[model samples]
Target: AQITGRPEWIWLALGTALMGLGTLYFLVKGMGVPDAKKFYAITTLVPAIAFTMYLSMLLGYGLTMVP
Candidate 1:
């Protein structure tokens, strides 16, 4: 077997997978928050932090992401 393509695609794939997993986890927790504080920490706080970081990079204001 042989493969040829930009290797950076792998990093993109991995990032997409992680974001998807985080989304699914949040969705599940949102449906039924197992713990009040844990739910707030994960579903509210973590996501807020992640979104701020993600959007900053996306909008070109600033980026905390490393590669």
Candidate 2:
């Protein structure tokens, strides 16, 4: 029950999970909707923001480690 080194797989898992959650939300609350800004925002903007945050973390980590 231990692990080490890189720890990059977790990021991929996080991204995939976010995408799945967004898709699930769209299916349950956004399928065939008219003028549903909140639904669109929830299903799209939230995940985009999440991924953007993840990317920013990666960038910061990379920049800090540069030689």
Candidate 3:
């Protein structure tokens, strides 16, 4: 396992789940309504950005030795 696997699971789950839930809600229910997709379009970035960041923390690499 990686260094912060446990917390990463927590971070990944929330971010991924939020985006997944919003997408499903948009497709399954929002399609029937108006401006739903448009509304979701912006919110979609929230989870995605967070998801990208934390996932990077999970298995991806980063920098150090800066000041």
Count of backbone clashes, every candidate in sequence: 0, 0, 0
List where candidate 1 sits over 4 angstroms from the true fold.
1-4, 34-67
lDDT against true structure, model 2: 0.57
Cα lDDT of model 3 overall? 0.55
Which prediction has the highest TM-score against the true structure?
Answer: 1
Please give the distance, in angstroms, between residue 32's alpha carbon in candidate 1 and its true position after superposition. 1.3
* Alpha carbon lDDT at 25, candidate 3: 61
Report lDDT per candidate.
0.55, 0.57, 0.55
Q: Give one digit per residue, the lDDT tens place, for model 3 in 17-53.
A: 6766655665555446569756676565555555555
Can you tell me which runs of candidate 2 are displaced by over 4 Å? Answer: 1-5, 8-43, 61-67
**What lDDT tens digits, residue by residue, belong to model 2 across residues 8-59?**
7466556746765765665556555666877666665566555555545555
Winner of 2 and 3 under TM-score: 2
Residues 1-67, candidate 1: write the lDDT tens digits. Answer: 0112755545544454566567667767766766876866665445445655555554445654452
The candidate maximizing lDDT is 2
Q: Rank the candidates by TM-score, best first.
A: 1, 2, 3
Q: Ten consecutive residues with minimal summed lDDT in candidate 1?
A: 1-10
